[PDB]
Structure formats: structure tokens, C-alpha cells
Amino acid sequence: LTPPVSAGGIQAYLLTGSGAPASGLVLFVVNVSNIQVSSSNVTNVISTVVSNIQINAKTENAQTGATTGSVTVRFPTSGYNAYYDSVDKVVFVVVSFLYPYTTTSVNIPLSYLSKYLPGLLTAQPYDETGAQVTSVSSTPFGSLIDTSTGQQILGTNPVLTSYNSYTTQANTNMQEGVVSGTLTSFTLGGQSFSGSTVPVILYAPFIFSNSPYQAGLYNPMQVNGNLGSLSSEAYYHPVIWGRALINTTLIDTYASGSVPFTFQLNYSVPGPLTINMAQLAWIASINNLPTSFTYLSYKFSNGYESFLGIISNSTQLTAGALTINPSGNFTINGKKFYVYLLVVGSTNSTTPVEYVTKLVVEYPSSTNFLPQGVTVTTSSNKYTLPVYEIGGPAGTTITLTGNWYSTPYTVQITVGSTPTLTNYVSQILLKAVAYEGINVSTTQSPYYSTAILSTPPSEISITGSSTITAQGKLTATSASATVNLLTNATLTYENIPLTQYSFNGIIVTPGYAAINGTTAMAYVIGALYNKTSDYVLSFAGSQEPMQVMNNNLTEVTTLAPFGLTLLAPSVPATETGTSPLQLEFFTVPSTSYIALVDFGLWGNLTSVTVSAYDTVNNKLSVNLGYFYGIVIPPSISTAPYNYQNFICPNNYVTVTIYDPDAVLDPYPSGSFTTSSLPLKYGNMNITGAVIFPGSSVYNPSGVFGYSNFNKGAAVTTFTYTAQSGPFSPVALTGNTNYLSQYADNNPTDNYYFIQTVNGMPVLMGGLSIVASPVSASLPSSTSSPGFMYLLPSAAQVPSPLPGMATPNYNLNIYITYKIDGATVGNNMINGLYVASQNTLIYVVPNGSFVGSNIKLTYTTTDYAVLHYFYSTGQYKVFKTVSVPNVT
């Protein structure tokens, strides 16, 4: 399994898992197999092998991968404990290092230790003198034999007392100490051995791999696939694409029982970034408004329409055929303001069609000019502010007449028959942040490595960097002003008299079709003109990530109150203030796919940084790993046929088919489902889709990261029920809604995982067969997805790992025409009928046995194989089964 493979030198393992038996016992394994080791020479080899190994303990900072020190000691050779597993060919020794077993040898179990070496179970270890025993017993620390003057190491060591209370006392002072191993080369039997280490040690830094590979993190999918675009400059590149699996190296040592992990991914987009944003709403005082326009509502895909919030200090607004409640109202300084929230349309609708709830607007304090937070409330005391509608038939002129102060002011709609929609297009520089959930228990510990989709089904926040500036004409009574933000969006201000204010706000939404309405980003600014001992114009603004949900424009978080001062002791001035601008959208879990492909945060124009975190236990990753994009067309193969391989009912046509995206579940006797919880990531509580082990769907409750959480029970277990058809096909059932959450080693249910709505595939994936002449087709309406059970073998060479993700799935086929015309009950034996699990038989007429054929098109399980290597005509991949004409 994982480490990615290195041998001949050391590789170390923690004994922990789900129900960890004693953590801080450590296994050391070296491989001797370039000489053959018998069961009589075994004595010679393991005495000398432990005579050349040296054992270590390394000091670094707990989180780092750089160097500041180590020490070296060696194993005994007199009183030695040394073993040889015959099957894997490995000389191994185990040692006990953490409290209370620091000070003493203990017997190590050869079962839990058998989680990291197989052949221990199938054959007992072999001991010195050519005996074989089942037992392991370790060397005890402080009675080893030194190489320092050929002495014996003390009974009490600094490393001893450091571990004898490791719980605090391994965390030392600035540093940590970690036990490790190494080998200095020697030759016996006539060959040499040296190899390497990839973090798996009894404390291992929470980082991601980068050694030995000259690319960083490995992609067991990349190599094979037709290309000619890259000559010799390529020899460095980590890549993955889309939904196709990057296998990760979530190195972790610092937990007990089940180990949950959350993920944070950090995506960003090579190439210039202009952003298109529809005008979700405008808010403005009516002094600041023009005195006519033409507009009609743009619609939004969570169910929302455009509005304008007039701010009229008239007691009763007169807009439309509507008589209008104060949608918000507030007061400052003796003057009372009233916000009137108004959609536009071809009708007046007296009912609010939407809400915006909990609007928090800043404005400048009148003495100090620090920001002033207020929320604006109806005369009926509603923070759920009604977003009404005015209008009436098209062409009609309808005079939105509110009095700024009590002096009349106007803005008159001409009812359009088309929207006059102005989308803000402007340059901003963004980052995207993503998250995902998993409860991990597996047999790969400490080195917990598994298969993560580089498009999650679960949340994203887009947060990124822009500029807002404020320009204002200090006159001596009045003040013209404006504020520019987003890099073409703006908010205008005509005259602001002394002691008095004007207000303006806009809501921006990514102008598309599943980000518009559905997420929002508000900027509402209050601006004060006044004097203290110097003439003062000032702006102060908060800015809110908000989200329409249940029509309520529900505030997520508010971000900074910025106060921008412009002081002028001299009477005239025209000064500026500056503030950062954060465009922040925090969308919905599933818009991780959906809105993600409606932006295109993914392609051969993408770059990715990856990070992880351990949930309840609260453990983080200080190295951020990486990868990039090169999309590839799939290769494909099939395995023999001869004309002979139809003849005899034991002469068969093998197939092994390849499409490298078509795994989602690594490792035999895997299987997994999903749920959702508020897992911890970082300093907070991410709503992530928690992948659950087992075939059993689960229903946890309560708050997670805590022991407020307690996992629920079985909802549905997923059951490949043997069907009663010809030659018994074995189709997958359960409560098939939860196919959404089901994936398994079988590739024919790996494409629901994200690309579904409610157990209804959106992407077809897995193998796809049709027959001809006599037709039968799978997966399809004839035979439901997961029509048979299927497994990977042992992985790729591009995978350096044994027993994990292979998109190589293995089947046997025959074709026959001497069981042609038979019937299984009244199920007529004539066509392609699946013999149970990984067998197949095709049946055909008594004459069309030659020219009988079958078409295989293995189908992509990643969306993003399409990209730019669709023009290869191997995006989805194309092969056939056939019978040659012979004379």
C-alpha cells in the first residue's frame, strides 16, 4: 500500500489505527532480495544486517522538513533480536519507544503489525540459528550495543525521559525528537543495499510528499494517453484533471481511534481575470438619483429579481400605484430616513416578492468619525425587510417621487419592455478556497493515503483582492462626492449639506445563472459632511457577504468597517481616501461543481494548492502541497482473441480495459458512503460532505469537532442482489436514492458521486457495451448501473503503490452459437447476457456467428477529460470484440 515505493533501506511504521493497541512501538523493515536468503543462511544475513543498520533520532521543529540535527546509535549483535519474513524477503526488527514501554521490551503483536507486512501471516518469521518461531520480541532501549567505543548505551537516555512522558515531553523546547533508522552500505552474499524513506515515521510531520519524486506528489493516471505536444522540456510536471483522482499523502501520527480529516483546497486560475457581475440591486438617496430613466428587472436563478431601494426622507413615498410601508427606517442626528425597497416590473405587486434581512450599514460618527453600525427596521419592527414591487404596463411613466429632506426630488421609471441591465465588467484578482470531508479508518496507518477528487461536491468561498477609493469635493457647505469600487462600479453623491448625510449601496452578484441571486456581495456606504475644527467629508463602509436562501437575503458574515477621513483646516479641498476591497462570495456546497464550471476555475489554465487538517483532535498541515493541469485523452486496450477462442467452451476472449479516471474507490474490500456534518477545518466549522466508510449510509447529528457529535445508525446498506436473468447478472440495489453517496471499487457507480441529482446520473461513466446483431446493452435501462460487481487488480507502474487504483478491470467473454436457441426458463438464450460477476457470454444465430461483434466504449468518469483533447477522438475510448472470417 502507501509509502510510494523505496526499498533496501529503511521504512518505519507506527502501530495505531481504529482501536490502537500501543502507539509508539515502531516497525523497521529493510529488504535483502538481490541475494537469495534460505533458512540456514538466514542466521548469517540477519546478524550482519542488524550489525550494519544504524538507528537514529532526529531533531527538527515538529512541523518542518529541514535539518538542524541528529544522533546515531546501533542495534545489539550480542543478545540480538532479528527476524526474517520469508515471503516478502525482509529482515525486520521492532523496537518499543513511548510511555510506559520506553524503558522495557514488550512483545509486539504479529497481527496489527501484519497490517504493514502481509507475508507475516501466511508464513511465521524465522529466527536466528535457522529456527522459525511465530513470536516477535523487541530489543529494549538502554541495553543496546554502541558503536561509540564498542560500549553499551545508558539505561536512562534524554530520549528515554522525553518519551517516558511523551504526552508533553516529546514537544520539548522549540524542537521535537523523532526516532528514525538508516543503513550504511555493506556487502555480504555478494550484493549491496541502500534505499529511501517517505514520511511514515512514529511522528511524522503533517505535510505532503516531495521526495523522492522530481515532480512532488505522484499521478498514477498521467503517463498513458496520446500526446505529441511535449518534447523535452517536460520532465518536471505534477498534474491531475477534474473529478479524476489525485491520491494524496495525508501524513498524520497524532491521533487515536477513528481519524477524521477535513480537506482545504486552494485553487487559482492562470490567465487574466475580468469578472462579469449583474446588477443584483442598487440603493440610493433620490438626490443622488437621476430624475428619469428606463429599466426593467433582470431575473436571478434562486428566485429573486432586481431592485432599487429609494432612500426618501418623505414620510410617504409615492412610487407606483403602491402605498408603501417604510421597508427600512432609521434616524441619525434628528433627521429620520426611510428606505423603501422596490423591485420594478410590468405590474405592481403589493406583496413583497423577496426579502433582504439584517442589513448592516455603516456611516461616519459625528465627533470622532469612526464607523457607526446600524440595522434598518420597518415601522412594524421587521429586520426581514420586505422587497416590494412597483411598475405597471410597459411604456408607462411612473414617477418615484420621494422628498429628499422635505424638498421634492424624482427618479421616473419608463417601464421597459427589455431590461437595460448594466453588468459590472472589471479586473479583480481572485483566489478560490474549497473544502471536503472524510472519516478515515483504513489499514494504511500512520500513512493515511486515499483518493480525493479535485472538484469537490462540497463548499467553496471565492475571496480575492480588489481596490475601492473615495473621491470628494470639500466645498464649504455642500460636497459633491463619489466612491469607486470593483474597478468600474461606483456610487455617486450630489450635494451633502453641513451636518448631513447621503447614502448609497450596491449589491453585486456574478452575472450568470447559478451564482446570480444565489450568492451576493453588498457594499453600502454612508457619508457624512460636517465640520469639527476642520471641514470634514468622510465615508465609512461595511461590506457583507450575503446569500439569498428562502428568498431572505441572509447575511453570512459582515467584513470590515473602514473609516476614510478627509480633514482640511483650509476651507477648500478635494481629497481621497483608499481602502482594500474583498470581493467575497461564499456559495452553496454543491455549486462547487456547478458554478465552478460556469466560471471555469478548472482546466489546463488552473493551479492548485492542497491542505489538510485532523478534525476532533485538531491537527493542521503546514506544508501546502501542489499540482497543476494537463488533460490527456485516455488509452484503451483489450486482451486476446483468436478464432479458436470462440470454438471450445474453455477457449475464451479476455479483455482488460483502461480509462484513467474510472476509479474513485482504491484498495480491495473498501466501499464508502457519505453524509454531512459541520467538521472542523482550521479555526472554524466547515459544512463538509463527510465521506463515511462502509457500505452503510449514516445519519450523524450534533456539532462535529466535538463530542457533541454522536454518529447515527444505518440508513441503507448497498446490496448487489443477484438477479434471476440468463446466467444470473447481479445488479446493484439498496435505497437507490443514496447511489448519490455511493461509490465502490466497482466503476459502475463512481459517477453518481457528484454528478447526480437524487440517484439519477448526470455524467455516464463506467464501461458501456452494446451488442449487434442481436442487441443487448449495459449499463442502461435493460440492466441498471452496477449490473455486476467488478474489482481492480494491483495498480499501475505510474502508481508506485501495490493494491490500489487501477482503472484496469478484468472480464472473460465467449461467443457461442451451440447453446443458440436454448432457454433459461422462458428467458430466451440468444443475445449478450452477463454471466454473473466478471464473466460474459454472447449468443448469436446459427449463421451470424461469423460477423458477430460487440462494441465497448469505456466512458469517462471525469467530466474534464473533455477540455482540448476531445479533438483526439479518444476522450471516451473505443474498442470492439470480433470474430474473424476464415475459409
Partner: protein
């Protein structure tokens, strides 16, 4: 130090392409990386360097310079990609090192934004050199990459 693609023979039907920074003033035991920022900026990021117990922060070490393809008419003139484009063309928050104690630094980057704005295509309107450039306060040098396009 020098920037270079080991290809100037570069076939064209590519949207992501890598190159070597040979720069053995900028080694470090792995992992290590760089926060690629405002100009491309080489804001060197590894928390994964220690030297007696201290975690390490941002260190300003240069920047990607520009990207230029050729305009020839009898005087030498170039075409810039602008620092807005470069905040977004090199936004990358990790570029790791491939071999310890010697720079190797891998960036794989777009030809989708390059194809689009320099007006390069698969061979349609293409023929140039195409050289992208870096600068560093690491060795205090200009250092430019080598690729020649034959126009496929």
C-alpha cells in the same frame, strides 16, 4: 542562475507546459516553496525550514518579469503582459522544489491565457519565439527562458 526550458524544439498543441529554473543559490531541504504573487512575485514561502527550532516566513526574492513574443520590422520592440495579468497568470501559492540543495523550481502554466491574448494559435497565426522571463534578488540578475517556435 538562468531560466530555461530544455526545449527550443517545442511542438505546439499544448495548453500546459513546464520549465526548469536552474538556480543553485536557492536550495533548501525539501519540502520548500514560493508564494507566487503581485508581479509574479517570488515571495519565498516555506514554514518547512528550521535552523534550531524556528519556523520560517515570506522572504521577497524576485518576480516573474513578463512574457514576450516577437515584433520585428527593423528595430527591436516587445509586447508586455501587464502586472494585473501577472497577478492572475502566476497566482500559484506553492511551487515546490524537485531536488534538495539546488533550485529546480517547477511552474506549469497556461497557454490558454497566452493563446488568447498574444494571439497565438496552433499554427494559424503563430510563428515567433516565445520567451518568458524572471528576475530575482537571489542572484540579482535578469534571466530569461529559451524556447523558439518553428510555427509547428
Amino acid at each position: 542562475a538562468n531560466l530555461y526550458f530544455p526545449s527550443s524544439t517545442t511542438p505546439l498543441y499544448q495548453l500546459s507546459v513546464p520549465l526548469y529554473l536552474s538556480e543553485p543559490y536557492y536550495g533548501s531541504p525539501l519540502p520548500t516553496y514560493i508564494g507566487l504573487g503581485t508581479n509574479g512575485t517570488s515571495l519565498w514561502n516555506s514554514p518547512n525550514y528550521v535552523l534550531f527550532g524556528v519556523s520560517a516566513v515570506q522572504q521577497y526574492l524576485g518576480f516573474i518579469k513578463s512574457i514576450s513574443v516577437t515584433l520585428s520590422n527593423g528595430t527591436t520592440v516587445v509586447i508586455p503582459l501587464t502586472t494585473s495579468n501577472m497577478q492572475t497568470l502566476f497566482p500559484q501559492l506553492v511551487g515546490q522544489e524537485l531536488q534538495a540543495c539546488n533550485g529546480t523550481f517547477q511552474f506549469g502554466i497556461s497557454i490558454t491565457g497566452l493563446e488568447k491574448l498574444l494571439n497565438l494559435n496552433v499554427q494559424q497565426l503563430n510563428n515567433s519565439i516565445l520567451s518568458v522571463t524572471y528576475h530575482d534578488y537571489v542572484t540579482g540578475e535578469t534571466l530569461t527562458a529559451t524556447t523558439k517556435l518553428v510555427a509547428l
